[PDB]
């Protein structure tokens, strides 16, 4: 038992390691999206910048969880970061929809984590998740949903100027 | 009789209280519109900001009338603020048209107020309405009419990019 | 179902709309108080400023709840804002006592909201209420109780100089 | 007929000269009050400063009317400035009450002036009175009424500390 460990159940430790892997996976998905918008046959620089920023933020989310694990006396166990589900994201709209789907999955994992921490009466972990993760995810889900709504309304992907003007105004 | 009261007829007092209720109602209508444009399936941030600003301005219009009432020795009598006529405003264009209709109704109430004050030979009240209310309403009616013209001309609500580009250029 | 909605029960949505109506009502009560202290036969400018500030803060509390509702994929349903229970608040002390009573009622509604959100396992909503509403209400209840204690101790409303000197020192 | 005179009836000219005399009289009343509060057996410096400021403002009101008369091609005819009704004003409260009475009389003369100008279809004169005189008088009446309310509530003149603390806080 670690000298610092107190009120930190092994199941919470395991769940945090699973959450760290999920955050790194999301970063890598966002990186793939960012790479796709940089292709010469896609050529949407603002979409590329948006998703690269999202990748870096998710890397920060993972590192903050690692700090939490070490702070509570648990031991980080890293696992393979699986490749994203596709290399061709097909459009700005499609990419935003997939990012929405991803963000809601991460949100769902965090809610399961919070329920475990509440079941284990770990108040510190609950408040950590509440303060640094759940509100951020709610904001990001709302942002992505707004992006999808606007793109769909503009006629994306079929209306040729829709992704181009969205890239300039909203993401520029 | 209030120690300050002079040349201030009870009918004018009643009309001012009615005007205060109308100004608060308009604020609450604008608030509902603002809430509608913030929905994830509408997602027009500049329309939301515009109508929230309008709500705050109408709240200021009401409070200025309350100050007038107290200044003249009349007594403020507040009434229920009725809910707006709808929660779904259906489009930017529709919202602007309804706001135009509302602004002209408020204008019509103020003109009736000015006619009453002229009939009662209350010069101070007439000049107050003229200086702080009628010109503002004329400017706001003209602004909203211009907004409606531009949106209709752009093809709103059916042309998908019309509300989006109006939100960025005119209201941004 | 809204594209952003996740772990947000319809009962919580309804309770938030009820909370929005309660916050707007409180703003309107504070506005009426503010109007009363501005009367020429009351003439307590600092009491008027205090309650007007309180009205604006409660309007901000309502708008923050509206933002929450839209963020979680729920739909705002506005209701009539009922008029305050009286137009004559009779004294500074009486007004402070009524404001204390109001603040504790709002607090009681928020605690019921938090209990519902805990029953529904909605951690985000619980933390939102905890972070932005409950502590503010505790501070405001304590402030108002202190104001009442000081006014009662000074001999208000019967001691003529008590409300006057409280208006200058504490609220000035 | 003056080369500049246009739409300026002789009755309006006479009424303006009467108004100029009334404004100078009010200045001289305020001066007498100011002198009274400077007496060694009264010794209320802030009451003295208040009424001296009021005297200077009324002198400015008279001079603005003189400018109006010359601007419209009328001829100023000055009359004796009658002495104030008393040299002993007996208290701060009594002085404020008399000032309220004076301000309302001046207000009543201005409303009669506005009615004459409206009967004579002199829009410029009406707007001049409305813009520079009626609103100022409404503000001053409300201020004096508030002062009287506060002094009466504090127990003035019988409560010894009431005029002293009002002089420091409100008029200081
Ligand atoms: Fe003191
Ligand atoms: Zn994350
Ligand atoms: Zn208005
Ligand atoms: Zn509140
Ligand atoms: Zn004057």
UniProtKB/Swiss-Prot annotation, chains A, B, C, D:
GO-annotated molecular function: ferric iron binding; ferroxidase activity; identical protein binding; iron ion binding
Record organism: Mus musculus (Mouse)
UniProt xrefs under Gene3D superfamilies: 1.20.1260.10
Biological function: Stores iron in a soluble, non-toxic, readily available form. Important for iron homeostasis. Has ferroxidase activity. Iron is taken up in the ferrous form and deposited as ferric hydroxides after oxidation. Also plays a role in delivery of iron to cells. Mediates iron uptake in capsule cells of the developing kidney. Degraded to release iron upon autophagy activation by nutrient starvation.
Positions annotated to bind Fe cation 1: 23, 58, 61
Protein name: Ferritin heavy chain
UniProt keyword annotations, A-Z: Acetylation, Cytoplasm, Cytoplasmic vesicle, Iron, Iron storage, Lysosome, Metal-binding, Oxidoreductase
Enzyme class at the top of the EC tree: oxidoreductase
